[PDB]
Amino acid sequence: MIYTVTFNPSIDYVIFTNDFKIDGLNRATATYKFAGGKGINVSRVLKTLDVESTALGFAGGFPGKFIIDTLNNSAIQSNFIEVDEDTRINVKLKTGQETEINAPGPHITSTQFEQLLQQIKNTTSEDIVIVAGSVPSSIPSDAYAQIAQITAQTGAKLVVDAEKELAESVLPYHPLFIKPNKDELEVMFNTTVNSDADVIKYGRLLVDKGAQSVIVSLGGDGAIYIDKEISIKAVNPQGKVVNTVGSGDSTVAGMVAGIASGLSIEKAFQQAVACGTATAFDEDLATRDAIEKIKSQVTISVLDGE
Amino acid sequence: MIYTVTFNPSIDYVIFTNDFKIDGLNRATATYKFAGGKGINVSRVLKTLDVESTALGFAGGFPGKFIIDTLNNSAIQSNFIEVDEDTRINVKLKTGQETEINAPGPHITSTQFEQLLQQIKNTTSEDIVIVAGSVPSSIPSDAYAQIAQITAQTGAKLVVDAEKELAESVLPYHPLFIKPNKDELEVMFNTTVNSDADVIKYGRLLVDKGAQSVIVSLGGDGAIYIDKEISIKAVNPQGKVVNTVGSGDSTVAGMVAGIASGLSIEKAFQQAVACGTATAFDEDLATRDAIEKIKSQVTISVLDGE
């Protein structure tokens, strides 16, 4: 089984109005409710790629109910921890000026965070655990390192989809892969990274620090995968970027799906990049036929090793 | 038994946020939620007054469940007709300004509306049916009349708090009272209403058209009750209007609770005005002690009749 972790899922409540007035009565003419979360996104892309996953994380109240349902309706399994405060509802106003109104997450007790850890404790060597996105304020700030520490004990494969500092924290626990960008490397190592060989070099030092594999995201210039024994360069096709939100979740999910479904590292990486690129070229998350279209146009090249 | 009917009940998603920024990422400093809707508010005030009622109307999805659980936690019964789409979520933005964003209802089928009417068909002469609110586009635009016509056969007292034309349409069905404002009177009878005598006149013409009685809201200037045999003037204490949302509802609930619990027309009316005033002087709906405090302060006078 593959699990995603979404610590703070939301309802993105998108509202179209008959124009907008501050301090006045406004009527919405159309609304939409989408389940939000970076761990949920991965699950969405995995499903797009015909790969099952179970969404974990924290859900509460009627909004938590809604998200569970949405995921059932997609045939994505879930086992969120029931918490005592409502899942957050973020409001996006789209008529004329496009405005965002984000709520803080629900309060999550220590018992509840423990209930999630208890699930990670029930994973095995053949499970993949994908933790994605920010750490909410009412869970421990080292939530990623705790989950990782448990995976190290179960054998489960840890994949982190977060910014550098949380991926750095999981390093000693040998994740399956982390996914920094070229610019994060420059900061980590206090050096200029300006060649594919330099990318290989600092990605391999992160492998020395515990990472089983590293994907270094390079933007529209593709990405590099680094192993202890191989590095790969993927170049994606050019095209108009519409919306890069989700591209990271997609890359992560393409990689995992490829691994899970018996593709080579090379081809799983190729799928990954095509996923991230597909999403980028789309308004929202990529369709399957968009992913397959792009992965033929993605060129793989072995940089070093075998 | 007393029944409130809310066609389009709501979650009122209240969001506190400072310096509301259009086209911007805002972060809510706090949020909360309650069950809103006119008939629901009436049930809430009747409850504060120790008077049972069962909420009727339409609920669906998990927004629907929230309203039922919220009412249940408040010890208010409900017998909502399950609809196939989500109960609406209305947004209230509390900065320095107060900005409401009201959503459309769920789509309500004819079969579901028929289910509601079947409930009104099971009423008896001892029952009170309160129908309050705007009519959602998906139900019969003559929905008030379709209810009013059943109560005329069952014998149940019909109470209406609606827009002018909808209030006008139930008149042939002899509702127990309707509740227009002075401004609706002015539109109805196409004339200027500038005195207590003018209010008695046009209000009693409504009693001639079928209303058993009429309460005319004068805002912070009190209210006038009009009968075939008497008219009464209520005058409420002055004070800082905090929030008048729900005060019309509270007035209706005060009047019904009075009649239901054996009070004179006069004292029931006094209770009615105290309720609407006390709400006005409050964040939300009035507490019991605010209501009682205030009705000691409400003056009652016979305008005409015996």
Which residue of A25, A29, A62, A87 to mutate against B (max B Cβ within 10 Å)?
A: A62
Q: Cβ separation of B99 and A15 shorter than 8 Å? A: no
CA distance A70 to A64: 10
Is the torsion defined by CA of A33, A39, A45, A48 positive or negative?
A: negative
Are residues A101 and B15, on separate chains, in Cβ contact within 8 Å?
A: yes
- Which has the closest alpha carbon to B289: B273, B277, B276, B278? B278
Dig out the tokens for A67 from the structure.
């998200």
| DSSP 8-class letter at A210 | T
Q: Which of B17, B66, B88 sits opposite A101 (nearest CB)?
A: B17
- Token pair in block for residue A227: 């192993």
- Give the pairing of strands B81-82 and B25-27: unpaired
d(CA A68, CA B281): 41
User: Is A23 a catalytic site residue?
Assistant: no
Instruction: Give the span between the Cα atoms of A113 and A58, in whole angstroms.
Output: 8
| CB neighbour list of residue A160: distance below 8 Å, 6 or more residues apart | A130, A131, A144, A148, A166, A167, A170, A175, A177, A178, A179
For residue B257, give the nearest of B56, B52, B39, B72 by alpha carbon. B52
Cβ contacts from A onto B, under 8 A: 81
Taking an 8 Å cut-off on Cβ atoms, the answer to whether A99 and B21 are in contact is yes
Distance CA A148, CA A169 (A): 9
Query: Which class is B1-306 in CATH?
Result: alpha beta
Minimum Cα–Cα distance from A19: chain B residue? B101
Q: How far apart are the CA of A218 and the nearest CA of chain B, in angstroms?
A: 27
d(CA A60, CA B278): 34
Active-site choice (A12, A127, A227, A249): A249
- HEC-encoded secondary structure of chain B: CEEEEECCCEEEEEEECCCCCCCCEEECCEEEEEEECHHHHHHHHHHHCCCCCEEEEEECHHHHHHHHHHHHHCCCEECCEECCCCCEEEEEEECCCEEEEECCCCCCCHHHHHHHHHHHCCCCCCCEEEEECCCCCCCCCCHHHHHHHHHHHHCCEEEEECCHHHHHHHHHHCCCEECCEHHHHHHHCCCCCCCHHHHHHHHHHHHHCCCCCEEEECHHHCEEEECCCEEEEEECCCCCCCCCCCHHHHHHHHHHHHHHCCCCHHHHHHHHHHHHHHHHCCCCCCCHHHHHHHHCCCEEEEEEEC
Length of chain A: 306
* Partner-chain residue, chosen from B33, B61, B102, that has the shortest CB–CB distance to A26: B102
Per the CB < 8 Å rule, is A28 touching B98? no
Domain ranges for chain A = 1-306
Chain B nearest-CA distance from A278, in A, is 26
Q: Residue A78, SS3?
A: strand
What residue in B sits closest to A91 (Cα-Cα)? B91
CA distance to A45, A132, A274, B88, per residue, from A139 (Å): 27, 14, 34, 31
Distance of alpha carbon B281 from the chain centroid: 17
Angle between helix A247-260 and helix A265-281 axes, rounded to 10 deg? 150
**Which residues of chain B does A103 touch, with a Cβ-Cβ cutoff of 8 Å?**
15, 28, 31
Distances (CA, A) of A266 to A46, A141, A195, A200, B231: 18, 34, 20, 15, 88
Q: Which two tokens stand for residue B306?
A: 């015996």
- Interface residues of B toward A, Cβ cutoff 8 Å, are 13, 15, 17, 20-28, 30-31, 33, 61-63, 65-66, 86, 88-89, 91, 93, 97-104
CB B206 within 8 A of CB B284: no
Pairing between β-strand B230-235 and β-strand B30-36 as defined by DSSP bridges:
unpaired
Q: How was this structure determined?
A: X-ray
CA distance A180 to B8: 49
Cβ contact B25–A100 (<8 Å): yes
